[PDB]
Amino acid sequence: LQLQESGPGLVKPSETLSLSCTVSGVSISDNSYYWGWIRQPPGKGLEWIGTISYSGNTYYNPSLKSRVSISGDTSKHQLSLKVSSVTAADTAVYYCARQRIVSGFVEWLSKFDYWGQGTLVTVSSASTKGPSVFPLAPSTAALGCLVKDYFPEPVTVSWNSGALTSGVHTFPAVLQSSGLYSLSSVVTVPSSSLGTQTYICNVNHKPSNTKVDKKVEPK
Amino acid sequence: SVLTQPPSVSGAPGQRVTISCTGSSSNIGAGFDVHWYQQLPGTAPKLLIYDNNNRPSGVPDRFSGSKSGTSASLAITGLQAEDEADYYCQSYDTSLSGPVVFGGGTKLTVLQPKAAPSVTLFPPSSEELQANKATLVCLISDFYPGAVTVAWKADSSPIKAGVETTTPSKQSNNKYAASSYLSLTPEQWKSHRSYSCQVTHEGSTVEKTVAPTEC
């Protein structure tokens, strides 16, 4: 029962956006199930994009019908969403979801029972940029990483390959005057462990395929 | 946006709260079922209520749905702090607007007490300084409500220049977080005795400070 959104985190204006969703544990052409795409602009609400049945048929939202195209690959168990001729207003988080239906005169679109986790796609004429990661030394003890000058979001930050959870607090990125982002992540740790345990952050930036690990040290 | 929802709804814990969703003749009035979703900050929507008033396993009895006329509403009894989220209504549509329609979205704000910010200020990294750049990282989180003032002062003299400050954003605990960056050249960092980032929340100001101390 899993849905995994996939695709680039950036597209330029007047360019076709392409996203994909890998479905797991259920067949993408199984009867009684429909699959669809939904989008959410930063700080805004949900907008349905379109839905595809268990057969070939697709239905779309008349507000984006001209540009939107959806396809299901029955052998790969995955969806495809195309959005041609993008603009600034297409910047959004795209979601993959499974849609139930009600069988009457027409199979009626219904409740979305399972949702994936979306992909933030930014529309911009700028190109991607990986972050310049710098360590923030500790001083009971607060230490962290500074992920500087990158584009566009998201950035994921793990500590000790996910082993360190307790005390982790990552902050919201700031959009700098330059057009690039800056993001910090810190961990509150026992000061007694500063010289005994290794503390390394794991900065991922999917738009530029960048992964930066950085050991943070005192002094 | 086609279905209309309250922009914002509040309530204290242990209270019963209601979130409305009223459309046209097409979306609800036509007789089509209403579905509700829950969205926690920074996460994907969860199926909360389906087919007007049914609960999927995993949803508390505290939640219930209702439909009458062109409206539908969501009822929460025994309101928890956990419930603070964004709520969305769904209905099939027969209008020019496409088959699936969502409502405007509702900011459900469960009561929180005043919370003073936790501020941590970091001096520019030595690695960063080697790059001929220098930024100070002021980090204030876990606070409520989402409103703070950031002041930067070289020694005792404040200077509003080179400042990149964020907008508060709530965390999983529904308390806000905000970060401020000060962009200097390494020589400015060195020139002054000490730099201070001070944040003013609830009439109480926290003034952390840093200075050019190599080690």
* H/E stretch holding B47: strand B46-49
**Residues A135, A197 within the same domain:** yes
Using a CB-CB distance cutoff of 8 angstroms, which residues of chain B are in contact with residue A181? none
**Residues A138, A184 within the same domain:** yes
**Residues A95, A132 within the same domain:** no
A125, A150, A168: which is the final residue of a domain?
A125
Contact flag B179-A184 (C-beta cutoff 8 Å):
yes
**Residues A117, A130 within the same domain:** no
CA angle B21, A5, A23 (to 5 degrees): 95
**Residues A108, A196 within the same domain:** no
Here the tokens at position B207 are 């003034």
Is-contact B94 B26, C-beta < 8 A?
Answer: yes
C-alpha B48/C-alpha B28 separation (Å) is 18
If you write DSSP's letter for every residue of chain A in order, what string do you get? -EEEEES-SEE-SSS-EEEEEEEESS-TT-TT-EEEEEEE-TTS--EEEEEE-SSS-EEE-TTTTTTEEEEEETTTTEEEEEE-S--GGG-EEEEEEEEEEEESSSEEEEEEEEE-B-EEEEE-SSPPB--EEEEE----EEEEEEEEEEBSS--EEEEGGGTB-TTEEEPPPEE-TTS-EEEEEEEEE-GGGTTTS--EEEEEEGGGTEEEEEE----
Enumerate the domain spans of chain B: 1-111, 112-215
Is-contact B44 B38, C-beta < 8 A?
Answer: no
For residue A56, is it left (φ>0), alpha (ψ between -120 and 50) or beta? alpha
Least Cα distance to A146 among A158, A133, A159 occurs for: A133
CA angle B93, B94, B95 (to 5 degrees): 95
Interface test with A, best of B93, B137, B170 (most A CBs within 10 A): B137
Contact flag A95-B104 (C-beta cutoff 8 Å):
no
**Residues A71, A133 within the same domain:** no
Cα A55 to Cα A10, A32, A33, A52, B93, distances in angstroms: 31, 10, 10, 8, 22
Using a CB-CB distance cutoff of 8 angstroms, which residues of chain A are in contact with residue B167? 172
How far does the CA of residue B12 sit from the closest CA of chain A (Å)?
A: 24
Paired with A46 in beta bridges are: none
Here the tokens at position B49 are 């209520």
Is-contact B165 A186, C-beta < 8 A?
Answer: no
The CATH classification number of B1-111 equals 2.60.40.10
**Residues A52, A9 within the same domain:** yes
Contact flag B178-A95 (C-beta cutoff 8 Å):
no
A 178-197 residues inside an 8 A Cβ radius of B: 182, 184, 186
SS3 B86: strand
Domain B1-111 and domain B112-215, same fold? Reply is yes
**Minimal Cβ distance to A136: which of B44, B137, B171:** B137
Q: What is the CA radius of gyration of chain B?
A: 24
CA-CA-CA-CA dihedral for A23, A28, A30, A33, to nearest 10: 80
Is-contact A150 A205, C-beta < 8 A?
Answer: yes
**Residues A54, A159 within the same domain:** no
Contact flag B44-A62 (C-beta cutoff 8 Å):
no
**Cα nearest neighbour of B214 on chain A:** A219
Contact flag B102-A174 (C-beta cutoff 8 Å):
no
Q: For residue B125, give the DSSP letter.
A: P
Q: How many CB atoms lie within 10 A of CB B191?
A: 12
The CATH classification number of B112-215 equals 2.60.40.10
Q: What is the CATH number of the domain that holds A213?
A: 2.60.40.10
C-alpha A192/C-alpha A182 separation (Å) is 30
Look at the block and give the residue holding tokens 């007490």. B113
Least Cα distance to B95 among A152, A92, A62, A94 occurs for: A62
Query: Does any CB of chain B come closer than 8 Å to the CB of residue A177?
Result: yes
Query: Strands across the sheet with A200-205, in order?
Result: A156-159, A200-205, A210-215
Contact flag A109-B92 (C-beta cutoff 8 Å):
yes
Least Cα distance to B172 among B53, B61, B85, B49 occurs for: B85
CA angle B94, B97, B103 (to 5 degrees): 95
Residue A102 burial by Cβ neighbours in a 10 Å radius (0-12, 13-18, 19+): middle
**Residues A115, A25 within the same domain:** yes
What resolution in angstroms, rounded to 1 decimal? 3.2
Contacts of B130 (CB under 8 A, 6+ apart): none
Cα A147 to Cα A184, B6, B168, distances in angstroms: 6, 38, 19
Half-sphere exposure of A56 (CA within 13 A, CB side): 0
CA angle A123, A154, B179 (to 5 degrees): 110
A 111-130 residues inside an 8 A Cβ radius of B: 111-118
Backbone angles phi, psi at B15, to 5 degrees: -95, 155
Contact flag A111-B131 (C-beta cutoff 8 Å):
no
Q: For residue B52, give the DSSP letter.
A: T
SS3 B81: helix
For residue B52, is it left (φ>0), alpha (ψ between -120 and 50) or beta? left
C-alpha A171/C-alpha A155 separation (Å) is 11
How was this model experimentally determined?
Answer: X-ray
If you write DSSP's letter for every residue of B152-212 in order, what string do you get? EEETTEE---SEEEPPPEE-TTS-EEEEEEEEE-HHHHHHSS-EEEEEEETTEEEEEEE--
How many domains would you assign to chain A? 2
A96, A125, A154: which is the final residue of a domain?
A125
Using a CB-CB distance cutoff of 8 angstroms, which residues of chain B are in contact with residue A108? 32, 92
**Residues A153, A120 within the same domain:** no
Residue A186 sits in which domain range?
Answer: 126-219
Contact flag A171-B46 (C-beta cutoff 8 Å):
no
Here the tokens at position B171 are 């965390």
Least Cα distance to A50 among A70, A31, A30 occurs for: A70
Look at the block and give the residue holding tokens 């738009």. A207
**Cα nearest neighbour of A110 on chain B:** B92
SS3 B129: helix
Task: Please tell me chain B's helix, strand, coil percentages from 3-state DSSP, rounded to the nearest 5.
Answer: 5, 50, 45
**Residues A75, A114 within the same domain:** yes
**Residues A142, A209 within the same domain:** yes
SS3 B133: coil
Residue B57 burial by Cβ neighbours in a 10 Å radius (0-12, 13-18, 19+): exposed
If you write DSSP's letter for every residue of A130-186 in order, what string do you get? --EEEEE----EEEEEEEEEEBSS--EEEEGGGTB-TTEEEPPPEE-TTS-EEEEEE
**Cα nearest neighbour of A4 on chain B:** B44
Here the tokens at position B118 are 């936790």
If you count residue pairs, one on A and one on B, with CB atoms under 8 Å apart, how many are there? 124
A99, A125, A151: which is the final residue of a domain?
A125
How far does the CA of residue A11 sit from the closest CA of chain B (Å)?
A: 22
Is-contact B4 B103, C-beta < 8 A?
Answer: yes
CA angle B169, A184, A177 (to 5 degrees): 80
